[PDB]
Design an enzyme around this catalytic site. Structure first.
Site, PDB file in Angstrom:
ATOM      1  N   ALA D  18       0.825  -1.204   0.000  1.00  8.02           N
ATOM      2  CA  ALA D  18       0.000   0.000   0.000  1.00  8.02           C
ATOM      3  C   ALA D  18       0.864   1.260   0.000  1.00  8.02           C
ATOM      4  O   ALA D  18       0.487   2.300   0.535  1.00  8.02           O
ATOM      5  CB  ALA D  18      -0.980  -0.015   1.151  1.00  8.02           C
ATOM      6  N   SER D  47       3.929   3.421   4.840  1.00  9.60           N
ATOM      7  CA  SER D  47       4.833   2.820   3.869  1.00  9.60           C
ATOM      8  C   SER D  47       5.917   3.805   3.515  1.00  9.60           C
ATOM      9  O   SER D  47       5.731   5.019   3.595  1.00  9.60           O
ATOM     10  CB  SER D  47       4.099   2.406   2.596  1.00  9.60           C
ATOM     11  OG  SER D  47       2.895   1.748   2.905  1.00  9.60           O
ATOM     12  N   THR D  49       7.155   5.161   0.881  1.00  7.38           N
ATOM     13  CA  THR D  49       7.031   6.293  -0.054  1.00  7.38           C
ATOM     14  C   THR D  49       6.743   7.639   0.635  1.00  7.38           C
ATOM     15  O   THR D  49       7.121   8.671   0.088  1.00  7.38           O
ATOM     16  CB  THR D  49       6.080   6.082  -1.294  1.00  7.38           C
ATOM     17  OG1 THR D  49       4.876   6.829  -1.139  1.00  7.38           O
ATOM     18  CG2 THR D  49       5.747   4.639  -1.557  1.00  7.38           C
ATOM     19  N   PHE D 122      17.664  17.771 -11.406  1.00  5.39           N
ATOM     20  CA  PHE D 122      17.894  16.561 -10.640  1.00  5.39           C
ATOM     21  C   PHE D 122      19.018  15.773 -11.286  1.00  5.39           C
ATOM     22  O   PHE D 122      19.319  15.965 -12.462  1.00  5.39           O
ATOM     23  CB  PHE D 122      16.612  15.732 -10.540  1.00  5.39           C
ATOM     24  CG  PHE D 122      16.269  15.304  -9.133  1.00  5.39           C
ATOM     25  CD1 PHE D 122      16.364  13.976  -8.754  1.00  5.39           C
ATOM     26  CD2 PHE D 122      15.857  16.234  -8.187  1.00  5.39           C
ATOM     27  CE1 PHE D 122      16.052  13.581  -7.458  1.00  5.39           C
ATOM     28  CE2 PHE D 122      15.536  15.841  -6.895  1.00  5.39           C
ATOM     29  CZ  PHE D 122      15.640  14.513  -6.530  1.00  5.39           C
ATOM     30  N   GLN D 243      21.457   0.483  -5.345  1.00  2.15           N
ATOM     31  CA  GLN D 243      21.804   1.886  -5.399  1.00  2.15           C
ATOM     32  C   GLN D 243      22.236   2.401  -4.045  1.00  2.15           C
ATOM     33  O   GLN D 243      21.586   2.158  -3.024  1.00  2.15           O
ATOM     34  CB  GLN D 243      20.639   2.735  -5.902  1.00  2.15           C
ATOM     35  CG  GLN D 243      20.884   4.221  -5.739  1.00  2.15           C
ATOM     36  CD  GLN D 243      20.082   5.050  -6.696  1.00  2.15           C
ATOM     37  OE1 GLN D 243      19.032   5.590  -6.335  1.00  2.15           O
ATOM     38  NE2 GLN D 243      20.563   5.157  -7.931  1.00  2.15           N
ATOM     39  N   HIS D 245      22.505   5.936  -2.501  1.00  2.00           N
ATOM     40  CA  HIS D 245      22.253   7.359  -2.624  1.00  2.00           C
ATOM     41  C   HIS D 245      23.457   8.084  -2.057  1.00  2.00           C
ATOM     42  O   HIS D 245      23.905   7.769  -0.958  1.00  2.00           O
ATOM     43  CB  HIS D 245      20.992   7.774  -1.882  1.00  2.00           C
ATOM     44  CG  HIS D 245      20.488   9.128  -2.267  1.00  2.00           C
ATOM     45  ND1 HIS D 245      19.218   9.335  -2.765  1.00  2.00           N
ATOM     46  CD2 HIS D 245      21.081  10.345  -2.229  1.00  2.00           C
ATOM     47  CE1 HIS D 245      19.048  10.622  -3.011  1.00  2.00           C
ATOM     48  NE2 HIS D 245      20.167  11.255  -2.699  1.00  2.00           N
ATOM     49  N   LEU D 255      17.761  10.012   4.656  1.00  2.00           N
ATOM     50  CA  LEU D 255      17.969  10.656   3.369  1.00  2.00           C
ATOM     51  C   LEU D 255      17.927  12.176   3.412  1.00  2.00           C
ATOM     52  O   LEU D 255      16.988  12.773   3.927  1.00  2.00           O
ATOM     53  CB  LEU D 255      16.967  10.172   2.321  1.00  2.00           C
ATOM     54  CG  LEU D 255      17.306  10.757   0.948  1.00  2.00           C
ATOM     55  CD1 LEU D 255      18.302   9.861   0.249  1.00  2.00           C
ATOM     56  CD2 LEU D 255      16.082  11.004   0.077  1.00  2.00           C
ATOM     57  N   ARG D 400      19.276   3.658 -10.992  1.00  4.19           N
ATOM     58  CA  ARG D 400      18.076   4.462 -11.023  1.00  4.19           C
ATOM     59  C   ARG D 400      18.428   5.938 -11.102  1.00  4.19           C
ATOM     60  O   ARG D 400      19.400   6.381 -10.497  1.00  4.19           O
ATOM     61  CB  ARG D 400      17.214   4.204  -9.789  1.00  4.19           C
ATOM     62  CG  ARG D 400      15.733   4.551 -10.006  1.00  4.19           C
ATOM     63  CD  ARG D 400      14.905   4.567  -8.728  1.00  4.19           C
ATOM     64  NE  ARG D 400      14.584   5.933  -8.338  1.00  4.19           N
ATOM     65  CZ  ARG D 400      14.798   6.459  -7.138  1.00  4.19           C
ATOM     66  NH1 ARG D 400      15.318   5.732  -6.155  1.00  4.19           N
ATOM     67  NH2 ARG D 400      14.483   7.724  -6.927  1.00  4.19           N
ATOM     68  N   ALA D 403      14.078  10.675  -8.788  1.00  9.47           N
ATOM     69  CA  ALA D 403      12.690  11.016  -9.119  1.00  9.47           C
ATOM     70  C   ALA D 403      12.053  10.079 -10.166  1.00  9.47           C
ATOM     71  O   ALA D 403      10.952  10.342 -10.668  1.00  9.47           O
ATOM     72  CB  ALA D 403      12.569  12.487  -9.534  1.00  9.47           C
TER      73      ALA D 403
HETATM   74  C1  LIG Z   1      13.965   5.693   1.342  1.00  4.58           C
HETATM   75  C2  LIG Z   1      13.606   6.786   0.384  1.00  4.58           C
HETATM   76  C3  LIG Z   1      13.261   6.474  -0.926  1.00  4.58           C
HETATM   77  C4  LIG Z   1      12.942   7.495  -1.809  1.00  4.58           C
HETATM   78  C5  LIG Z   1      12.975   8.808  -1.383  1.00  4.58           C
HETATM   79  C6  LIG Z   1      13.315   9.123  -0.071  1.00  4.58           C
HETATM   80  C7  LIG Z   1      13.633   8.111   0.824  1.00  4.58           C
HETATM   81  C8  LIG Z   1      14.005   8.459   2.243  1.00  4.58           C
HETATM   82  N1  LIG Z   1      12.666   9.830  -2.260  1.00  4.58           N
HETATM   83  C9  LIG Z   1      12.308   9.574  -3.563  1.00  4.58           C
HETATM   84  C10 LIG Z   1      11.986  10.613  -4.433  1.00  4.58           C
HETATM   85  O1  LIG Z   1      12.012  11.782  -4.055  1.00  4.58           O
HETATM   86  N2  LIG Z   1      11.631  10.343  -5.736  1.00  4.58           N
HETATM   87  C11 LIG Z   1      11.584   9.041  -6.189  1.00  4.58           C
HETATM   88  O2  LIG Z   1      11.263   8.797  -7.367  1.00  4.58           O
HETATM   89  N3  LIG Z   1      11.903   8.016  -5.306  1.00  4.58           N
HETATM   90  C12 LIG Z   1      12.269   8.262  -3.995  1.00  4.58           C
HETATM   91  N4  LIG Z   1      12.597   7.230  -3.119  1.00  4.58           N
HETATM   92  C13 LIG Z   1      12.524   5.800  -3.570  1.00  4.58           C
HETATM   93  C14 LIG Z   1      11.031   5.440  -3.481  1.00  4.58           C
HETATM   94  O3  LIG Z   1      10.415   6.052  -2.355  1.00  4.58           O
HETATM   95  C15 LIG Z   1      10.728   3.953  -3.448  1.00  4.58           C
HETATM   96  O4  LIG Z   1      11.398   3.339  -4.523  1.00  4.58           O
HETATM   97  C16 LIG Z   1       9.220   3.734  -3.617  1.00  4.58           C
HETATM   98  O5  LIG Z   1       8.471   4.601  -2.788  1.00  4.58           O
HETATM   99  C17 LIG Z   1       8.786   2.305  -3.324  1.00  4.58           C
HETATM  100  O6  LIG Z   1       7.389   2.367  -3.176  1.00  4.58           O
HETATM  101  P1  LIG Z   1       6.496   1.050  -3.264  1.00  4.58           P
HETATM  102  O7  LIG Z   1       5.028   1.410  -3.339  1.00  4.58           O
HETATM  103  O8  LIG Z   1       6.890   0.270  -4.502  1.00  4.58           O
HETATM  104  O9  LIG Z   1       6.825   0.286  -1.869  1.00  4.58           O
HETATM  105  P2  LIG Z   1       6.849   1.002  -0.416  1.00  4.58           P
HETATM  106  O10 LIG Z   1       6.315   2.392  -0.518  1.00  4.58           O
HETATM  107  O11 LIG Z   1       8.229   1.019   0.192  1.00  4.58           O
HETATM  108  O12 LIG Z   1       5.880   0.186   0.575  1.00  4.58           O
HETATM  109  C18 LIG Z   1       5.820  -1.229   0.599  1.00  4.58           C
HETATM  110  C19 LIG Z   1       4.387  -1.693   0.853  1.00  4.58           C
HETATM  111  O13 LIG Z   1       4.304  -3.104   0.884  1.00  4.58           O
HETATM  112  C20 LIG Z   1       3.615  -3.567   2.033  1.00  4.58           C
HETATM  113  N5  LIG Z   1       4.217  -4.834   2.485  1.00  4.58           N
HETATM  114  C21 LIG Z   1       5.563  -5.125   2.551  1.00  4.58           C
HETATM  115  N6  LIG Z   1       5.722  -6.386   3.008  1.00  4.58           N
HETATM  116  C22 LIG Z   1       4.494  -6.904   3.227  1.00  4.58           C
HETATM  117  C23 LIG Z   1       4.085  -8.145   3.689  1.00  4.58           C
HETATM  118  N7  LIG Z   1       4.962  -8.891   4.349  1.00  4.58           N
HETATM  119  N8  LIG Z   1       2.735  -8.405   3.824  1.00  4.58           N
HETATM  120  C24 LIG Z   1       1.794  -7.447   3.495  1.00  4.58           C
HETATM  121  N9  LIG Z   1       2.219  -6.213   3.039  1.00  4.58           N
HETATM  122  C25 LIG Z   1       3.541  -5.946   2.904  1.00  4.58           C
HETATM  123  C26 LIG Z   1       3.765  -2.447   3.044  1.00  4.58           C
HETATM  124  O14 LIG Z   1       2.674  -2.384   3.932  1.00  4.58           O
HETATM  125  C27 LIG Z   1       3.826  -1.212   2.179  1.00  4.58           C
HETATM  126  O15 LIG Z   1       2.521  -0.734   1.943  1.00  4.58           O
END
Ligand SMILES: *Cc1cc2c(cc1C)nc1c(=O)[nH]c(=O)nc-1n2C[C@H](O)[C@H](O)[C@H](O)COP(=O)(O)OP(=O)(O)OC[C@H]1O[C@@H](n2cnc3c(N)ncnc32)[C@H](O)[C@@H]1O
Ligand SMILES: C/C=C/CC/C=C/CC/C=C/CCCCCCC(=O)OC[C@H](COP(=O)(O)OCCN)OC(=O)CCCCCCC/C=C/C/C=C/CCC
Ligand code: HEM
Ligand code: SF4
Ligand code: F3S
Ligand code: FES
Lengths: 102, 239, 138, 613
Positions: D18, D47, D49, D122, D243, D245, D255, D400, D403
């Site tokens: 999510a 999460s 993001t 960027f 990656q 950063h 970050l 990557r 952004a």
């Molecule tokens: C760490 C980071 C990354 C980042 C960033 C700043 C930081 C501190 N800034 C960015 C930016 O300005 N521009 C950009 O393009 N990317 C940036 N990033 C990287 C980016 O945030 C991530 O690559 C991206 O947000 C990943 O998002 P995604 O939707 O694919 O996954 P998530 O947000 O990390 O959340 C994971 C979800 O999965 C659910 N989950 C995980 N494990 C389970 C299991 N076991 N069972 C059920 N659900 C699960 C979590 O609940 C969560 O919703």
């Protein structure tokens, strides 16, 4: 639809500023009309105040309706009682006066 | 060495006849990150792995680790441990909440309230959406500053005694500020009706301007000030 | 699932659960703004109690105001003891009055930051003490 | 056994995740008329993001005039030609529409004098196919764009009848003869186990940065979907591509945005000389993340490190105007003060390369469908999709761009939804799993819940974390990787010696973090064995024993009178990694990268070149 809660809220602030206008004015110009206004405003402001307190702490359907009634009775009586006091006795301003040069 | 004492609110829903007690731990601050969550994670990882609490981000944007630390609601990952050793850290879960299991409070109702005020852009004519970008002036944008930054951590609402007494019907600062966030977002079309959703003695009007909310917010925001601004809109809108 | 259904289910699960409520008043840090809101409640409550006692006795009690004054005079009017009653009568009044103004300025939208809160607070306390000493002196 | 109550659910579609990816897929499926579940182990807004800062790329051309194809060139180049060009075409062309989609949902983008979305410079972005200087297409909400990306989508998500399973932890896929039937999940609240079944399953679980000791990512970034694909004997792709950063904060590794460098911020060694002028004269500190990161590391090893320990660099912002730091970068200002005690307007931030993004993950089509590898050829996995950091369509390839993941999220969450809405109809035969399916996930659960071994969960975690940190950093060498490998394989063996303390059903976080460890290890094994096997330097994977980019051609010279190298004689190919879960043995294979776009006519293939900034 009805915008009642916002009206009640505004009403409150209106009598609040009114009650605050009256207290100095009652001091300066103590007459009868000032006695009744003070009775009206004092018990109306008072009535709405306890209202809020009741609505905050009194939990339950028929139990809140009851307080709201008990408070309704209390106010009407308070207002009549003061009105009586103004008509058939000294009156608020003069009572405070007597009370104070004591 | 430098030993700091922690007293944390405990409860196990799986242990028969357990009641809410306080367990005390002790952490050498020499060997620990400067924040309260560091401590929590450290005792969990080294002393007792029964200590159950929410956390994710470690930098204070997720809002997961919200809890009452030494009287006030904040985020444990963002508040420093009091280096004063003659003091014991008292840690509790968010005030006046059903404790699922120590420090972890049921926020279902909290989230439900947020849902109830429709926190998204609403348009009268939704047929042009996704095609072109909506225009919004730099000035119109600023009105959102100090409102959009909310983390839904719940420190504020969970600090409002009005929310304690009346959690069922009164929406609370967090939610109310977001209603306002949408109210003054110039792209929204449903301001008059977002107002009307509050026309009862409870949803908004249980706020008596106590101001714990603003005073406690881990992010520097001003929910109370926004409730004020809502209340003046309610008093002044036409229809 | 609607916001309303989520609320129904929250309450249904918790009321019929073995879950405790997390401590609140027993654990929250006392702050001056908070204490001052409580006293605004209390003073507001004490005053209505007084105004009601006063009107109700004008209806339910015998004789005139003068008569009940003579009753007070016959207790033997202690000098500073009368100042004490005067003070304790006008102290809640002034408190609630000033803090009530401060409330109205909030309704306007002003003074609602934590710096302004502590300052305007202290000010209210100072105005209360001074108008309470002055009014009892009149 | 039925100590655990099994509760059966039936949906058209399930999304696991999510974050932005998860949400966009979830309500995209619902909007399309699909009765959709969403399983998430955190309240959606928690999460990772939310943590996102810098922005989301899209050639709206709000600052200057732009072309999405320019964004395309930048990305394939960024990817060091390990980037599947068909997915990069799809993404970059869609990019404007995806960002207008967000803003029309209510994302409170920062603005320009025009009232259009404010975008900024960027790292790695150019105009006129690399020839036209710096580009400004990073769309943002100050430096808190991920937070409001997530909250606006979450806000939106409430308009649909998507069934959410909040704080449910997915254990494995419901797999039947190579077809995915759903997910089996632990409900954290009451310990109960739930089989959610659907025709189509989307995995959107983000990355596994927690394989490392130092990572900008959340505590919850434990590669749990990557883990599930693995236990199903399906391949992962390019996992050794991690990656770093450039600008993570020195203390807590949090970050600090590339936006800083994009807004005019400078990287500085202990001499004070702005050293990125030395390493990349053209792009300076606005070069690629793999290059900047790599240049930072080399300045440390050579004694130009900063602070008492001489182990970091400086991110100077204090020369920028305060009002610009206030409006563009209020977030990093806040956290640099909170975590490092630094006033951005007076002093420079201490910064250091730190694990950030997993460009590897679950291989897919550009349509979102998970690929397996049969007889050296691509095969679509029936009923299985993936998106976001968890996936690997390799739109990011070997590195990557900044952004591009927030973009990845919104484009491919949308894609998985469309692929489903275009391949079947809501109400169709939801395929029926055996009554005893997901049996072993429970047994695993039960063995971990009652675990009375020798080594505590957290101790084996730190073991893995520090091992990955010292053996698979910025630069790697054969021997260091080799020691790294058997060290992780030893730690996989140590899993059988695990100790749990908590016996409860309700919120047994001891237990979930243990399930998380099992997940982190499978991501670790594959990252490290794959890393040791790749004998070249490309993108983020820098080898000191193999400095060369090993392609089919020597792409520095014209390719005419030259022999094309056989597939198994070069390294311009995706790593496909498998693991036998019983012994933790890593098997590995390779598939080619997709060079052709979706239409040559609209978007020309950028052939490989010597890539510098
Ligand atoms: C760490 C980071 C990354 C980042 C960033 C700043 C930081 C501190 N800034 C960015 C930016 O300005 N521009 C950009 O393009 N990317 C940036 N990033 C990287 C980016 O945030 C991530 O690559 C991206 O947000 C990943 O998002 P995604 O939707 O694919 O996954 P998530 O947000 O990390 O959340 C994971 C979800 O999965 C659910 N989950 C995980 N494990 C389970 C299991 N076991 N069972 C059920 N659900 C699960 C979590 O609940 C969560 O919703
Ligand atoms: C219900 C009310 C119940 C009655 C009991 C409550 C009395 C307390 C009121 C405190 C007000 C302080 C005023 C002091 C005073 O003596 O005024 C001067 C008065 C002397 O004359 P003077 O003209 O000064 O002449 C004297 C010679 N210089 O001048 C006036 O005319 C007094 C008018 C003031 C009106 C205020 C009444 C508000 C009631 C508040 C209710 C709170 C309940 C507790
Ligand atoms: C002229 C001076 C006064 C002013 C300006 C004033 C104003 C106010 C205001 C603005 C409030 C709202 C408090 C809130 O928002 O929580 C309030 C509360 C209240 N007031 Fe007054 N008031 C005055 C005198 C009085 C008097 C004399 C009485 C009783 C006879 C009274 C009775 C009450 C009560 C019972 C409450 C409710 C307490 C609460 O809701 O917290 N007030 N007052
Ligand atoms: S206003 Fe502040 S305290 Fe309230 S939920 Fe938002 S971030 Fe938390
Ligand atoms: S603590 Fe409260 S009563 Fe209103 S001003 Fe804040 S929500
Ligand atoms: S864990 Fe993100 S707010 Fe503390």
């Amino acid at each position: 639809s009805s915008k009642a809660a916002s009206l009640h809220w505004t009403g409150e602030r209106v009598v609040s500023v009114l009650l605050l206008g009256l207290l100095p004015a009652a001091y300066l110009n103590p007459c009868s009309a000032m006695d009744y206004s003070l009775a009206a405003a004092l018990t109306l402001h008072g009535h709405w105040g306890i209202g809020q307190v009741v609505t905050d702490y009194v939990r339950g359907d028929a139990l809140q309706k009851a307080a709201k009634a008990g408070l309704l009775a209390l106010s009407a009586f308070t207002f009549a009682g003061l009105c009586y006091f103004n008509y058939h006795d000294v009156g608020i301003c003069k009572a405070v006066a007597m009370l104070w040069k004591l | 060495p430098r030993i700091k004492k922690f007293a944390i609110y405990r409860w196990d829903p799986d242990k028969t006849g357990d009641k809410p007690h306080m367990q005390t731990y002790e952490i050498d601050l020499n060997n620990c990150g400067p924040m309260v969550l560091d401590a929590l994670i450290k005792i969990k990882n080294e002393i007792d792995s029964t200590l159950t609490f929410r956390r994710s981000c470690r930098e204070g944007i997720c809002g997961s680790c919200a809890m009452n630390i030494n009287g006030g609601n904040t985020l444990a990952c963002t508040r420093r441990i009091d280096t004063n050793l003659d003091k014991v850290s008292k840690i509790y879960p968010l005030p006046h909440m059903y404790v699922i299991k120590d420090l972890v409070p049921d926020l279902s109702n909290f989230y439900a309230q947020y849902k109830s005020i429709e926190p998204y852009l609403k348009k009268k004519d939704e047929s042009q959406e996704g095609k072109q970008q909506y225009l919004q002036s730099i000035e119109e944008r600023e009105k959102l500053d100090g409102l959009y930054e909310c983390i839904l951590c719940a420190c504020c609402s969970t600090s409002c005694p009005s929310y304690w007494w009346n959690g069922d019907k009164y929406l609370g600062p967090a939610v109310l500020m977001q209603a306002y966030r949408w109210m003054i977002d110039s792209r929204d079309d449903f301001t008059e009706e977002r107002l009307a959703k509050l026309q009862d003695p409870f949803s908004l009007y249980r706020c008596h301007t106590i101001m714990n909310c603003t005073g406690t917010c881990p992010k520097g925001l001003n929910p109370g000030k926004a409730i004020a601004e809502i209340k003046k809109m309610m008093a002044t809108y036409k229809e | 699932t609607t916001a309303k259904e989520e609320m129904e289910r929250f309450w249904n699960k918790n009321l019929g659960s073995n879950r405790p409520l997390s401590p609140h008043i027993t654990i929250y840090r006392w702050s001056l703004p908070m204490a001052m809101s409580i006293c605004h409640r209390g003073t507001g409550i004490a005053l209505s109690a007084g105004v009601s006692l006063f009107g109700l006795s004008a209806l339910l009690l015998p004789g005139n105001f003068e008569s009940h004054l003579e009753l007070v005079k016959s207790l033997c009017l202690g000098p500073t003891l009368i100042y004490t009653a005067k003070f304790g009568i006008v102290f809640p009044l002034m408190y609630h009055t000033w803090n009530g103004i401060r409330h109205l300025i909030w309704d306007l939208g002003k003074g609602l930051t934590i710096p302004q809160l502590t300052q305007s607070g202290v000010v209210v306390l100072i105005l209360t003490v001074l108008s309470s000493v002055g009014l009892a002196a009149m | 056994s039925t100590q655990y109550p099994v509760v059966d659910h039936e949906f058209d579609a399930v999304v696991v995740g999510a974050g932005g990816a998860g949400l966009r897929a979830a309500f995209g499926l619902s909007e399309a008329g699909f009765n959709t579940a969403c399983v998430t182990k955190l309240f959606p807004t928690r999460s990772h993001t939310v943590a996102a800062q810098g922005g989301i790329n899209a050639a709206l051309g709000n600052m200057e005039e732009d072309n999405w194809r320019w964004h395309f060139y930048d990305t394939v180049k960024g990817s060091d030609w390990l980037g599947d060009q068909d997915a990069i075409h799809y993404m970059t062309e869609q990019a404007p529409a995806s960002v207008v989609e967000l803003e029309n949902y209510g994302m409170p983008f920062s603005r320009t004098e025009d009232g259009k979305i404010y975008q900024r410079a960027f790292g790695g972005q150019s105009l006129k196919f690399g020839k036209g200087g710096q580009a400004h297409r990073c769309c943002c909400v100050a430096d808190r764009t991920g937070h409001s990306l997530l909250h606006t989508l979450y806000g939106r998500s409430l308009r649909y009848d998507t069934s959410y399973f909040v704080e449910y932890f997915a254990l494995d896929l419901l797999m039947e003869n190579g077809e995915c039937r759903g997910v089996i999940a632990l409900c954290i609240e009451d310990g109960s186990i739930h089989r959610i079944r659907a025709r189509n399953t989307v995995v959107a679980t983000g990355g596994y940065g927690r394989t490392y000791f130092s990572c900008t990512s959340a505590h919850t970034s434990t590669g749990d979907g990557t883990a599930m694909v693995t236990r199903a004997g399906l391949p992962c792709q390019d996992l050794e591509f991690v990656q770093f950063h450039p600008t993570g904060i020195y203390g807590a590794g949090c970050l600090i945005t590339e936006g800083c460098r994009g807004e005019g911020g400078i990287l500085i060694n202990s001499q004070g000389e702005r050293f990125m002028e030395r390493y990349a004269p053209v792009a300076k500190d606005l070069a690629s993340r793999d290059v900047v990161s790599r240049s930072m590391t080399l300045e440390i090893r050579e004694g130009r490190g900063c602070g008492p320990e001489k182990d970091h660099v400086y991110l100077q912002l204090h020369h920028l105007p305060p009002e610009q730091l206030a409006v563009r970068l209020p977030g990093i200002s806040e956290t640099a003060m909170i975590f490092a005690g630094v006033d951005v307007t007076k002093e420079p931030i201490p910064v250091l390369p730190t694990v950030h993004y997993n460009m590897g993950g679950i291989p897919t089509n550009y349509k979102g469908q998970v690929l397996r590898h049969v007889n050296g050829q691509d095969q679509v996995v029936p009923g299985l999709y993936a998106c976001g950091e968890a996936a690997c369509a390799s739109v990011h390839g070997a590195n990557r761009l900044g952004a591009n993941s927030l973009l990845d999220l919104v484009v491919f969450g949308r894609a998985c939804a469309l692929s489903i809405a275009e391949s079947c109809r809501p109400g169709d035969k939801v395929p029926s799993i055996k009554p005893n399916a997901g049996e072993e996930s429970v047994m695993n659960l039960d063995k971990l819940r009652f675990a009375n071994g020798t080594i505590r969960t957290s101790e084996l975690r730190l073991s893995m974390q520090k091992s990955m940190q010292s053996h698979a950093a910025v630069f790697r060498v054969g021997s260091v990787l080799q020691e790294g490998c058997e060290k992780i394989l030893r730690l996989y063996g140590d899993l059988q010696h695990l100790k749990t303390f908590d016996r409860g059903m309700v919120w047994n976080t001891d237990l979930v973090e243990t399930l998380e460890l099992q997940n982190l290890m499978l991501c670790a094994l594959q990252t490290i064995y794959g890393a040791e096997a790749r004998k070249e330097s490309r993108g983020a994977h820098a080898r000191e024993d193999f400095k060369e980019r090993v392609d089919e051609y020597d792409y520095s010279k014209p390719i005419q009178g030259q022999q094309k190298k056989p597939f198994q004689e070069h390294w311009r190919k995706h790593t496909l990694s498998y693991v036998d879960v019983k012994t933790g043995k890593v098997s590995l294979e390779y598939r080619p990268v997709i060079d052709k776009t979706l239409n040559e006519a609209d978007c020309a293939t950028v052939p490989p070149a010597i890539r510098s900034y």
